[PDB]
């Protein structure tokens, strides 16, 4: 058993292939040991909270976690602390009041700054459509997630302010391709004067642009994703997607781990009344 865990929430998402490989190069630059971990897929809350509660009662001396809901794992997490676990919260906001509500606390929360995801990806399209501008439309991370929620708000509020665009839609496809396909085809059916979709991650775009295509609507309507993973890239090169804000899982991860080894390196558990270290990492726009 490594002297480091990390639940990630699932490795059928190359976002979390990419933060796994950040987090196995970064550990061998600290001279740390890691044991990796994921649920199998997006849904899994109650098999995610019985895998970290087992992690927790194994020998660790550190877990870091993105968990797959706000809430999911507030009490397992609330236990580890109480046990003297050095816990680090991966990009995916554990609901901090519930936490404290708990009894817990992280040593640190590493995410991108999510309002300006949604925002970029928002004021390119805002670029493209020009003085023209046109209908626009979200299609949403599950609800209860603060990073979905920040990307939804930051795309939502650069539209409102360009009074040429009118954003017409904005509900979830769960991060799933297959509901991405189909939430996108029914908004393409109930507006047919669509100029562009924002996605809150690329499993999500990849579906959308798979209903653009088949409303055989290529180029004259806009699909920007969120996080850079390859086959998203490669639409974006083909010509398939327009754009995607990429983000950086595998700096998300190296950033976490050294958070969770130089908090072990104290020798005490962060104070449940202290605020957590925060650490962004950046985001960039990605166009063909
Ligand atoms: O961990 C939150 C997140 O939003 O979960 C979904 C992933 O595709 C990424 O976008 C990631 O940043």
Same mark, same amino acid.
């Given at each position: 058993?490594?002297?480091?865990?990390?639940? =990630?929430?699932?490795?059928?998402?190359?976002?979390?292939?990419?933060?796994?490989?950040?987090?196995?190069?970064?550990?061998?630059? =600290?001279? +740390?040991?890691?044991?990796?971990?994921?649920?199998?897929?997006? #849904?899994?809350?109650?098999?995610?909270? *019985? =895998?970290?509660?087992?992690?927790?009662?194994? %020998?660790?001396?550190?877990?870091?976690?993105?968990?797959?809901?706000?809430?999911?794992?507030?009490?397992?997490?609330? &236990?580890?602390?109480? %046990?003297?676990?050095?816990?680090?919260? /991966?990009?995916? %906001?554990?609901?901090?009041?519930?936490?404290?509500?708990?009894? #817990?606390?992280? !040593? #640190?929360?590493?995410?991108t700054d999510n309002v300006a995801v949604g925002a970029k990806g928002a004021d390119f399209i805002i670029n493209?459509?020009?003085?023209?501008?046109?209908? $626009?439309?979200?299609? !949403?991370?599950?609800?209860?997630?603060?990073? #979905?929620?920040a990307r939804?708000?930051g795309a939502?509020?650069a539209?409102?302010?360009?009074? *040429?665009?009118?954003? +017409?839609?904005?509900?979830?496809?769960?991060?799933? &391709?297959?509901?991405? /396909?189909?939430?996108?085809?029914?908004?393409? *059916?109930?507006?047919?004067? =669509?100029?562009?979709?924002y996605?809150?991650?690329?499993?999500?775009?990849?579906?959308?642009?798979?209903?653009?295509?088949?409303?055989?609507?290529?180029?004259? +309507?806009?699909?920007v994703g969120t996080?850079g993973?390859? !086959?998203? &890239?490669?639409?974006?090169?083909?010509?398939?997607?327009?754009a995607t804000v990429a983000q950086?899982?595998?700096?998300?991860?190296?950033?976490? /781990?050294? /958070?969770? $080894?130089?908090?072990?390196?104290?020798?005490?558990?962060?104070?449940?009344?202290?605020?957590?270290?925060?650490?962004? $990492?950046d985001s960039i726009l990605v166009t063909?």
């Amino acid at each position: 058993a490594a002297e480091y865990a990390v639940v =990630l929430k699932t490795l059928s998402n190359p976002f979390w292939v990419d933060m796994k490989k950040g987090i196995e190069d970064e550990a061998k630059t =600290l001279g +740390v040991s890691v044991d990796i971990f994921a649920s199998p897929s997006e #849904g899994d809350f109650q098999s995610q909270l *019985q =895998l970290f509660e087992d992690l927790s009662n194994k %020998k660790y001396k550190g877990i870091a976690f993105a968990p797959l809901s706000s809430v999911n794992l507030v009490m397992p997490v609330a &236990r580890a602390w109480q %046990k003297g676990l050095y816990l680090v919260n /991966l990009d995916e %906001k554990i609901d901090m009041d519930n936490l404290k509500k708990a009894g #817990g606390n992280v !040593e #640190g929360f590493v995410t991108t700054d999510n309002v300006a995801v949604g925002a970029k990806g928002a004021d390119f399209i805002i670029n493209k459509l020009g003085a023209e501008g046109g209908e $626009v439309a979200i299609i !949403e991370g599950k609800a209860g997630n603060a990073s #979905g929620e920040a990307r939804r708000n930051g795309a939502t509020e650069a539209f409102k302010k360009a009074n *040429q665009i009118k954003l +017409v839609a904005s509900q979830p496809a769960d991060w799933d &391709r297959i509901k991405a /396909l189909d939430v996108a085809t029914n908004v393409l *059916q109930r507006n047919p004067n =669509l100029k562009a979709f924002y996605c809150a991650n690329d499993t999500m775009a990849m579906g959308v642009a798979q209903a653009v295509a088949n409303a055989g609507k290529i180029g004259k +309507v806009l699909v920007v994703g969120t996080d850079g993973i390859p !086959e998203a &890239r490669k639409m974006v090169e083909a010509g398939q997607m327009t754009a995607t804000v990429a983000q950086n899982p595998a700096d998300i991860g190296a950033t976490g /781990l050294k /958070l969770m $080894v130089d908090a072990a390196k104290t020798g005490k558990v962060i104070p449940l009344e202290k605020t957590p270290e925060f650490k962004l $990492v950046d985001s960039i726009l990605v166009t063909k």
